[PDB]
Amino acid sequence: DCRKSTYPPSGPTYRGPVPWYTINLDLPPYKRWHELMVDKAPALKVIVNYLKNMINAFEPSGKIVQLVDQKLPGLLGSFPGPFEEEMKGIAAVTEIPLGEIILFNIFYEFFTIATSIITEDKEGHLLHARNMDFGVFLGWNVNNNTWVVTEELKPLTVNLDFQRNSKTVFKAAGFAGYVGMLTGFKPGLFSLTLNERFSGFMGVIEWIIIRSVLENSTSYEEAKTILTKSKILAPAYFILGGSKSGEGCVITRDRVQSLDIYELDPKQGIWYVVQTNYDRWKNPFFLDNRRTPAKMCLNRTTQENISFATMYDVLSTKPVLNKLTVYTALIDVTKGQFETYLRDCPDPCIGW
Numbered sequence: 319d320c321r322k323s324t325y326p327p328s329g330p331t332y333r334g335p336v337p338w339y340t341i342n343l344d345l346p347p348y349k350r351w352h353e354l355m356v357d358k359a360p361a362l363k364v365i366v367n368y369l370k371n372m373i374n375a376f377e378p379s380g381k382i383v384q385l386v387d388q389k390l391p392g393l394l395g396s397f398p399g400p401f402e403e404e405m406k407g408i409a410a411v412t413e414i415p416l417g418e419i420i421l422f423n424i425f426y427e428f429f430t431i432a433t434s435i436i437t438e439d440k441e442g443h444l445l446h447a448r449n450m451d452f453g454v455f456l457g458w459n460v461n462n463n464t465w466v467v468t469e470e471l472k473p474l475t476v477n478l479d480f481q482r483n484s485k486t487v488f489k490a491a492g493f494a495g496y497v498g499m500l501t502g503f504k505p506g507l508f509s510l511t512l513n514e515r516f517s518g519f520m521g522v523i524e525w526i527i528i529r530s531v532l533e534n535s536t537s538y539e540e541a542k543t544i545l546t547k548s549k550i551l552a553p554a555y556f557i558l559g560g561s562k563s564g565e566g567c568v569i570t571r572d573r574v575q576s577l578d579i580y581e582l583d584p585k586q587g588i589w590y591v592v593q594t595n596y597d598r599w600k601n602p603f604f605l606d607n608r609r610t611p612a613k614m615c616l617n618r619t620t621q622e623n624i625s626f627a628t629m630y631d632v633l634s635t636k637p638v639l640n641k642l643t644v645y646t647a648l649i650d651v652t653k654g655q656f657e658t659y660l661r662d663c664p665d666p667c668i669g670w
C-alpha cells in the first residue's frame with residue numbers, strides 16, 4: 319500500500335538535497351561549466367567507463383569509443399556552435415578526452431528510466447513530478463557494477479539555474495558533464511521532462527532539443543509544436559506541463575513523427591497522467607512494474623488531495639521508488655517551485 323507522511327523529506331529514503339549552480343549564458347560557452355566541473359572528473363570517469371562497457375557488452379563486435387572517436391570530427395560540426403565549445407570546456411576542466419565527454423552526452427539518455435507524472439488539482443493548477451533512475455540500459459540491462467556506478471552518480475546531480483546575466487531563463491535538473499537536460503521548466507510558461515522510449519539505439523549508432531526549447535521557446539504552444547514535429551535522434555516520450563488550466567500533454571514520439579499526443583481532461587475525469595517507459599495504450603509487461611502502483615496511489619489520493627506532499631508520497635512508494643532511483647523532482651510552473659531530492663531505498667527494495 320501507498321506511503322504517507324513522507325513530506326517534507328526525511329529518513330532513510332532521503333539522501334539529501336540537490337545543490338544549486340547558476341549557468342551564466344552571457345559567459346563564453348567554453349567557460350560556462352567550469353565552476354560546476356570542479357573536483358568531479360573522478361566520478362565522471364567512472365560513469366563514462368560504465369557506458370563504454372555496457373555498450374561494448376551489448377555489441378561485442380566493435381569498441382564504441384573507437385567508432386565515436388574515429389567518427390568524432392564529423393560529430394563536432396554536427397553540433398550547434400555552443401555545445402561543442404561547452405563540451406571542450408568540460409573536457410579541459412576534467413582532463414577527460416573530448417570523445418568521451420561526447421560519448422557521455424550522446425548516450426546518457428539510453429541509461430535512464432523514469433516515472434513522470436502531471437496532475438491538475440480542482441483549482442486547475444498543474445504539478446509536474448518525476449522519479450529518475452540511472453544504470454538500466456535500454457530499459458532492462460544492467461551488470462554487476464550498476465549499483466556502484468549509480469551511487470557514484472548521485473553527487474553529480476545538480477539543479478541548474480540558466481541565466482542571462484541576472485535574469486533566469488530556465489531551470490533544470492541535470493548532471494555535471496551533461497550539457498543537455500531531461501528535466502526543466504520556464505517559470506510561468508511550461509515544464510518538460512523526457513522519458514526514454516525503447517522500440518532507436520542503432521539509429522544513433524547508424525547516425526554516428528530539450529535544451530533549445532527550454533532556452534528559446536517563449537510559450538507552451540511553441541514548445542509543443544517543436545516537440546511534436548521536430549526530428550529527433552531516438553524515440554522518446556515528452557511530458558509537457560503548462561501554466562494555464564488544462565495545458566498538459568504526453569507526446570509519444572518516434573524519430574520523425576508523433577505517434578500519440580494525449581491531453582489532460584479533468585472535466586472528463588482524467589486529472590493525471592503517468593508516463594513510464596512503455597506506450598500507455600499497450601499492456602505492461604512483467605518488467606513494467608512502476609506505472610500501475612503510481613496510478614493506484616494517485617487514485618487513492620484523489621484529485622481533492624493532490625499536492626507536493628501527496629505527490630512525494632506516491633514517488634516514495636516501492637517500486638515507484640527503487641534502488642536505482644537517483645532523485646525525485648517536484649515542479650509547480652505557475653508558482654515557480656522546483657524541488658529536487660536525492661533518494662535511497664533501503665532493503666528490502668527491488669532494483670527497478
Ligand SMILES: *[C@@H]1O[C@H](CO[C@@H]2O[C@@H](C)[C@@H](O)[C@@H](O)[C@@H]2O)[C@@H](O[C@@H]2O[C@H](CO)[C@@H](O)[C@H](O)[C@H]2NC(C)=O)[C@H](O)[C@H]1NC(C)=O
Pocket residue numbers: 462463466
Ligand atoms: C564485477 O565483476 C568483475 C569481474 O570479476 C568476476 O566476476 C565477479 C562476479 C567475481 O566472481 C570475480 O571474482 C570474477 O573474477 C569484477 O572485476 C574484478 O575485480 C577485481 C579487482 O579488484 C579482480 O577480481 C579482477 O581484477 C576483476 N576482474 C575483471 C575481469 O576485470 C568487479 O570487481 C565486480 N564488481 C563488484 C562491484 O564486485
Ligand SMILES: *[C@@H]1O[C@H](CO)[C@@H](O[C@@H]2O[C@H](CO)[C@@H](O)[C@H](O)[C@H]2NC(C)=O)[C@H](O)[C@H]1NC(C)=O
Pocket residue numbers: 398399400401529530533534
Ligand atoms: C537559444 O537561442 C539563442 C539565441 O536565440 C542561441 O544563441 C545562438 O546559438 C547559435 C547556434 O544555435 C550560435 O551559433 C550563436 O553564437 C548564438 N547567438 C547568440 C545571439 O547568442 C542559443 O544557441 C539557442 N540555444 C542553444 C541551446 O544553443
